From a paper:
Pyruvate kinases (PYKs) catalyse the last step of the glycolytic pathway by transferring a phospho group from phosphoenolpyruvate (PEP) to ADP, thereby generating pyruvate and ATP. M1PYK is the constitutively active form of the enzyme and despite the high (96%) overall sequence identity, M2PYK has a low basal activity but is activated by the allosteric effector fructose 1,6-bisphosphate (FBP). Each subunit of this homotetramer consists of four domains: A, B, C, and N-terminal. The active site is formed by a pocket between the rigid body core and the flexible B-domain.
Phenylalanine and alanine were the most powerful inhibitors (nearly 100% inhibition) among all tested amino acids. Although all three tested inhibitors show a similar inhibitory pattern on M2PYK, they have different IC50 values: alanine has the lowest IC50 of 124 µM compared with phenylalanine (410 µM) and tryptophan (445 µM). Co-crystal structures of M2PYK with alanine, phenylalanine, or tryptophan show the amino acids all binding with similar poses in the amino-acid binding pocket (located between the A-domain and C-domain of each subunit). The carboxyl groups of the amino acids form strong hydrogen bonds to the side chains of Asn70 and Arg106, and the amino groups hydrogen-bond to the side chain of His464 and the main-chain oxygen on Ile469. They adopt a binding pose that is very similar to that observed in the activating serine structure except that the hydrophobic side chains of the three inhibitory amino acids cause a widening of the binding pocket and make contact with the carbonyl oxygen atom from Arg43, effectively pushing away the N-terminal strand. Binding of the inhibitory phenylalanine, tryptophan, or alanine stabilises the T-state structure, each protomer subunit is rotated by 11° relative to the R-state structures. The X-ray structures of the inhibitory amino-acid complexes show the N-terminal strand pushed by ∼3–4 Å compared with the R-state serine structure. The repulsive push from alanine, phenylalanine, or tryptophan leads to an interesting hydrogen-bonding rearrangement in which four Asp24-Arg400 salt bridges stabilising the C–C interface in the R-state switch partners to stabilise protomers across the A–A interface in the rotated T-state. The C–C interface in the T-state conformation is held by hydrogen bonds between Asp487 and Trp515, with the indole side chain anchored in a pocket further securing the T-state conformer. Measured intracellular alanine concentrations from various cell types range from 0.4 mM to over 4 mM, which are sufficient to inhibit M2PYK activity and stimulate (cancer) cell proliferation.
Numbering used by the authors:
A (entry chain B): 8 to 531
B (entry chain A): 13 to 531
C (entry chain D): 395 to 531
Write the structure that this text describes.
Amino acid sequence: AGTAFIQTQQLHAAMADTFLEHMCRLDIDSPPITARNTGIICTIGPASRSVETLKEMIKSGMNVARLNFSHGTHEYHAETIKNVRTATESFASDPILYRPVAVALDTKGPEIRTGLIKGSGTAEVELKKGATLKITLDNAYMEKCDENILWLDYKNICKVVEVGSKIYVDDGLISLQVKQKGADFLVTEVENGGSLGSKKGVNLPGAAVDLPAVSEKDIQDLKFGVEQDVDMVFASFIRKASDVHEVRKVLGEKGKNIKIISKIENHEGVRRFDEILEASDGIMVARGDLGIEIPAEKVFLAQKMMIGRCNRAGKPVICATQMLESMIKKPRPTRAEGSDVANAVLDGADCIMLSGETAKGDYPLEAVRMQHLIAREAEAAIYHLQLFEELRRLAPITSDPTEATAVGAVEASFKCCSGAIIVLTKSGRSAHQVARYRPRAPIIAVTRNPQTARQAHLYRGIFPVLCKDPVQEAWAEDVDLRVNFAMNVGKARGFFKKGDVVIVLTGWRPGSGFTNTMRVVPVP
Amino acid sequence: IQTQQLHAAMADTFLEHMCRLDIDSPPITARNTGIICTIGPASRSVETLKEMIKSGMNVARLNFSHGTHEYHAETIKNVRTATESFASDPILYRPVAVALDTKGPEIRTGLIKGSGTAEVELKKGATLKITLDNAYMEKCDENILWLDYKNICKVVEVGSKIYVDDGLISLQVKQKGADFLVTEVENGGSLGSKKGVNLPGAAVDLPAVSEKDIQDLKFGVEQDVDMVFASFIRKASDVHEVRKVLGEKGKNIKIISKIENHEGVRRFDEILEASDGIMVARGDLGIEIPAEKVFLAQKMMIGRCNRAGKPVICATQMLESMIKKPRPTRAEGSDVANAVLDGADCIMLSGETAKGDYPLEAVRMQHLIAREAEAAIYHLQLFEELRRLAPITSDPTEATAVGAVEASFKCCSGAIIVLTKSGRSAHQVARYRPRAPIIAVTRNPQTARQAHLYRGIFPVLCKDPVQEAWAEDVDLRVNFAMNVGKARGFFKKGDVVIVLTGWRPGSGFTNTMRVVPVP
Amino acid sequence: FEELRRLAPITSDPTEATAVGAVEASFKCCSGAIIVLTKSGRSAHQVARYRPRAPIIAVTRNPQTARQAHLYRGIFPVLCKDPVQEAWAEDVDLRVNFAMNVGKARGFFKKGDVVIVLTGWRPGSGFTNTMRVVPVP
């Protein structure tokens, strides 16, 4: 089998009257009665790169493999991809057990990195609380950083910063307040002490950081992605609509189908969220990176807002960073980490992304299993009913065949207590339009296009499944084949059993543009 | 000064309401969730407390796990001195409650071999013998370990876990015995002297009130505390014995039951019924039940307390980084917020304020987070659901109380002013979770303090003498609250507020609602 | 009622907000009546506008308003000829207890049922702003 593969459901429990009443019925002692619908993106790196590790991670519920292009060469990551694809395809000899797995390319982005600390690349220095530290743009100091002077590469840092602004260094381990501006320098006072190292990430709280959207390194990384046929791109440090447009433009005609997830990493991104969301295919709320750049008592408000708007607009949203960080060192997570993951699933996220945990952790395989366990337990606390009733009200009244059918499918999934909604689809769009309305039941999305099978994991509650059977001549039999394929998948997964009811979305003519034909089918 | 800016028309759907959250605009609502600070070494002084009350402390907790009766008597005296410093202007007088947190029943280990402070390495896979023989009680080491709980052999089976030093070390039982256990170390660590032992999912049959606590609870009654946080509650009869010890003399002292273990969560319903309120101790649960199921417990317990209309308090692991640092982490702010949004009435700061380097900033961040989180609450559905789920009765007070909340939404009221002796009339309003603050006016100083337990009650102590003409005595107290509310910033000249009063001085019920424009 | 409440325009008028709450409560308490003290009749009309189930016993000293009230549905007007008591609170209690006796005689309610009562607070305050839930003596 796998560990995470057999998610048996026990549908037909009549859903509660009110959201309050639903919380009151949560029994921690009973097991979860629902498929884990929230996708799981694991970052691949040193500890999980091998073909044998990946096989077990896919079995334990990995869906997307992220590659971090901040570090490593093109040759290095080409083999990381080859290993993912070998591991994924190991299960292909039984199409029922074949879970597809996506490949994500996370850009380096624009960044502000410090210089090399005095006697060699690895040596640190103590910045203590209240000491003066000079920041310089003069390249003479770029391998001569110490307690007193610090280089960094961003040449317009003097222009976007004023007196009194903060500068967070090494992902907010150290924080500095500017006392005096200058021609090509700043004089700062250390507030939070720490061990400063070589080439560390600097952030500039609420500054219009005017770097290029796509650095010249990234223009090569994005072409490598297109060349390697990645499925999605996590574009870093997005500030505005035109940043996303230039990420699109670089991918071009050749990789137009590659999905662009914009990462909201800074204050400017959150302010311009609406224009970014419109231009982006999805969103990634990078919480740790926001925690530097905006106040701690306002980050949860940003997360909720962004997750909210993405749900309304029907685009994926991903909750990244600071998920299960203790599992780099330890075999289990803390109470507060499990609660943090849960509350992100309940806020409405589609996917959860494990950063260090799986890339360079001592426990990469258990990290996936805890993520899976938390996401499935959290699923029981979701009151799917109001998510839907609100999403139906807020949607604009149109006479589109597909969207009216898609709603009715979800509608019926509640009234029939359906085990699933089976959706036949080439592009994935028909399945996405169903998932937009947040059903309780899993959406088994059947397809022949292998990319759409991979790209589907971005959406919540879609279980993609790749049909490799040849197209039957009689159109009606080709449907019956693919439907009966999903029936067998769903029975094997445990979503439903002999004699339950499921909803099925299909076309009517092979040639009709729309997925317009809904039917209520009892399971053979 | 929590200025409100009422009259913003509330959103259509909860989804739409989340979508309207702008982090850049300031919060448009009074911080309704109470703040309980634990007083200790860093915050004990009269001068520290004055600034903490100013920055939004409501309840002062005293931890009776540590310290003497003489020590805590003076901690209380300092709270009362600081509180009363503001009494010379009754408009600015915020009352402040005193909470007595019991030690409880516990399982403590012995003293490690050569001295009280000296550790030993338990390594992963080594055998460790647990013993009830008192000969070893000051001779613990890598091999043998004493502990005081004499029936430990009876409640544990082969294969059960034993977490030691608040879950730093964990041991699996291999062999039971007459008066011993043989365990295998799973999580290694530095074992010390007198450490807390827990027994995951065991019917731990210790006394509900230890003999130490029977003296601590009489000291509480003697010092006129306002509430008692009873520790390690497992079942209804535990709460009943905490009640029985307080007795006739301290019958008015509120008993908040702390749910610290697996058995408490299983029997939550019977405990909630017998308790005045609840405290979800999250860190202590995180030891005894799995980490992927604690948030489910918190949500359930906070849920049921909201339904039943009793206070619930979210304690432990709130802002722990602020022991050492002047600000909290992103994840701590999010953890506090999500507990306010889950539906908690109060938030309790443990170390942060007791023995922290930054006790005063810890209160200010708690206040800031709780006020920002307030904007994310969709008060409307909380109410509509609570109204539906409530049982149909023709009680005068409860029907009036609902109508007051009802009207608080339709008039976009700045407040609900409630006159009350016992506090009950104000509690019945707060039960239905209005958006507006509830200014609860009273002459009884204890009810003013005990009100902070409930969410959205702003208690205020009227020290004026009782006017002969009953109607003027009402008008006085109402106009007192009007001035408080204007000073706080809850509302201004020309806004509307709801006012609950009696009709006869003698009528049992708070039955008279009126919609009043602010003079 | 639920439709008439939705379609009504949101205002912070004391009288209209009280009047709705009176009807609201008339359903939740299963009230036998809504007793309304009124000179012009308007306070009773504003209650009747929202179409309660319970009868509205409208108490008044103005004999014309007692007659003109029959136009409105569910108002049972009743003319109090007692003189105005000096203590305002007793003058209310008189008129309320007058309607209680009318309502018991009509059969609208009996000893121990609940009724809603709309009054003023100051003799001088423009609004009928004071609602109370009263058990029948």
